[PDB]
Design a protein around this ligand. Structure first.
Ligand SMILES: Cc1cn([C@H]2C[C@H](O)[C@@H](COP(=O)(O)OP(=O)(O)OP(=O)(O)O)O2)c(=O)[nH]c1=O
Ligand SMILES: [Zn+2]
Ligand SMILES: [Zn+2]
Ligand SMILES: [Zn+2]
Ligand SMILES: [Zn+2]
Lengths: 159, 140, 149, 142
């Protein structure tokens, strides 16, 4: 009785969500019962805030794709339960916040995942490989596109 | 410039990976353009030399259909342009193609993606006339 | 600053150390100043903050079994901020599949992260976890074989 | 008829051989009967002669496979006998010209990966090989 967990991290603008739908479409086109979840009020996928709300619903599905997984506090127990019930869990999440500090409870999922990959963005200042996200406003994050965030490399993140 | 090459059987996601790699540059204020058999529909790649002269990022989908794929991609990468190609590596008989192999010794990055077998639900790496299958299901 | 951090994780018997010396030999064969560190040819230390002064003249730093070094985090960042390339091969999870928090705190700071797989020693499929019973007391297993034992 | 083929290409000094023995060590440490071939390990020039010998092995690793003329027939025949075949070969010559049958093996391979070296001129990403000894270079330096 075994599933697995695929983990996709990376900075903003690196394409995590698109890679998520590629892996999901791989199974869905092979007649898998696929469902996708994303975090509501972000800016065919379900929009929820707590994963404990959909624990009962997706019992009949074999493929679970989750976008913006760092926002779900119960992401780890959820993925472990589904992976132990024979379901394939694919997660696209941020590894670090704007302060390059760990995001919520998303790292505790790596000792439980079968595959972990980090994608790269393009730096919007020195047009090199970006691996960090940097907010442009004055708050201390807040969700947004590129108007307030930019994907940068190591040298451009510190001034 | 350089050449990124993405191969794999049908239903493996080559086109989606193509647009991901292209969108990475496009979001960084690159002048990006895409070609299929911003968007272009052509039959011969030697015909589009004039159009994309002002572009730095070139994406090509279903590159095996272009007979001059090998000369075109190099004759674009040697002018500082980034070329990202999503193409099939093998025909229905898992036989070599006319002139898509000759592009790999010139590419800087080459990756082969996998599909899901539509018969035995395992890893798929071949195409059969359509269904994507593995080795056991291809020669059952 | 000018450097970066490459992170190689995976269970035991997945080949992390071999991949480490491959990535280093790529730079070393290009006349880079490389140095390698291991836990107590490569230096053998217990605290990484002792060799901060020593390896100042090196551009490539490879570390094996990074989970054992408590100061792994503040080390790699400092080295990466001095223009140095830092390559780490460490375990992601213990035998209880619990995090090596010192290692996990390095991922939001790393430029590259990859997880390698081993081969299951019970049902011979892909393995991503380590279990206790040297090799005669550890085994690389998959999810199904980790719980059913 | 239930095996597969893993393919490793790249220029010189990219680490293809080290990756080869890493992938083989993965299986060998899991009590697989592994054997390695170069131009327990055998050293031969034609692969079609050792078909009978390695019948009891499930994992076959080949290095510098471009030098074996019968690499394709061998890898297909061996993969169709439940054996895992891992090949590490050069993708391009010193003239950036295609290889004899290494490419004709890609439509038959289950996994294909290309590794990169470090440029020995501008210390950037290298993907090509050049002659003087030998050096791994990028596009601009070639
Ligand atoms: C950097 C950062 C972002 N956010 C927010 C902003 C983002 O919209 C959201 C998650 O962003 P993502 O959806 O991961 O970024 P993206 O979808 O635009 O990039 P891609 O699809 O290519 O992977 O989280 C925070 O809440 N805190 C932070 O520190
Ligand atoms: Zn930058
Ligand atoms: Zn099949
Ligand atoms: Zn097992
Ligand atoms: Zn160079």
């Amino acid at each position: 009785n075994g599933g697995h967990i695929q983990l996709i991290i990376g900075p903003m603008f690196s394409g995590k969500s698109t890679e998520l739908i590629r892996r999901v479409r791989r199974y869905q086109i092979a007649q898998y019962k696929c469902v996708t979840i994303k975090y509501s009020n972000d800016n065919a996928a379900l929009e929820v805030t707590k994963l404990c709300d959909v624990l009962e619903a997706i019992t009949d599905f074999s493929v679970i794709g989750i976008d913006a997984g760092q926002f779900f506090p119960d992401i780890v127990e959820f993925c472990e339960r589904m992976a132990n019930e024979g379901k394939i869990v694919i997660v696209a999440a941020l590894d670090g916040t704007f302060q390059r500090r760990p995001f919520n409870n998303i790292l505790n999922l790596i000792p439980l995942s079968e595959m972990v990959v980090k994608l790269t963005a393009v730096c919007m200042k020195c047009f090199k490989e970006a691996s960090f996200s940097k907010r442009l406003g004055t708050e201390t994050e807040i969700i947004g596109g590129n108007d307030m965030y930019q994907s940068v490399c190591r040298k451009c993140y510190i001034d």
